[PDB]
Amino acid sequence: MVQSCSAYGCKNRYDKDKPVSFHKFPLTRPSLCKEWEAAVRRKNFKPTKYSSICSEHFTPDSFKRESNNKLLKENAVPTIFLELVPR
DNA sequence: GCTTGTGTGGGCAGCG
DNA sequence: CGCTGCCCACACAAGC
């Protein structure tokens, strides 16, 4: 989406100049989808699993269908969201 | 190989 | 007024 990722402060709106791609939540991996919520530890929880997220938040390994079988690693959740808190 | 399934991609309304 | 929550079709890979 061209609004913002499900991360905290990542308003890295789709910019082809920057090396990032977009994707949707692991709808086919609910439990795993759920830990993504654990990464969205902020009150300002962005859109749900229906919205789209960008590459930078996960490891290339877990990027998408290019993972193991056809989706990300069930044991991988976007931790690259941020260091802690922006200013 | 072609067709179907899952990933991919962006928007509008209600409340501080 | 801006942000959060949920939906549909197409391309590539797998199956027949």
Curated annotation (Swiss-Prot):
Localization of this protein: Nucleus, Nucleoplasm; Nucleus, PML body
Zinc-finger ranges (THAP-type): 1-81
Does this UniProt record's set of keywords contain Cell cycle? yes
Effect caused by changing residue 41 to A: Does not affect DNA-binding
Q: What's a single GO CC term here?
A: PML body
Gene Ontology BP term (one): regulation of transcription by RNA polymerase II
Q: So what does mutating residue 50 to A actually do?
A: Partially affects DNA-binding
* Keywords noted in UniProt: Cell cycle, Coiled coil, Disease variant, DNA-binding, Dystonia, Metal-binding, Nucleus, Transcription, Transcription regulation, Zinc, Zinc-finger
Phenotype for residue 80 to V? In DYT6; mild phenotype; does not affect activity
Q: What is the effect of changing residue 11 to A?
A: Partially affects DNA-binding
Q: What is the effect of changing residue 37 to A?
A: Partially affects DNA-binding
Tell me how this protein assembles. Homodimer. Interacts with PAWR. Component of a THAP1/THAP3-HCFC1-OGT complex that contains, either THAP1 or THAP3, HCFC1 and OGT. Interacts with OGT. Interacts (via the HBM) with HCFC1 (via the Kelch-repeat domain); the interaction recruits HCFC1 to the RRM1 promoter.
Q: What is the protein's given name?
A: THAP domain-containing protein 1
Question: In which organism is this protein found?
Answer: Homo sapiens
Query: Highest lineage ranks of the organism?
Result: Eukaryota, Metazoa, Chordata, Craniata, Vertebrata
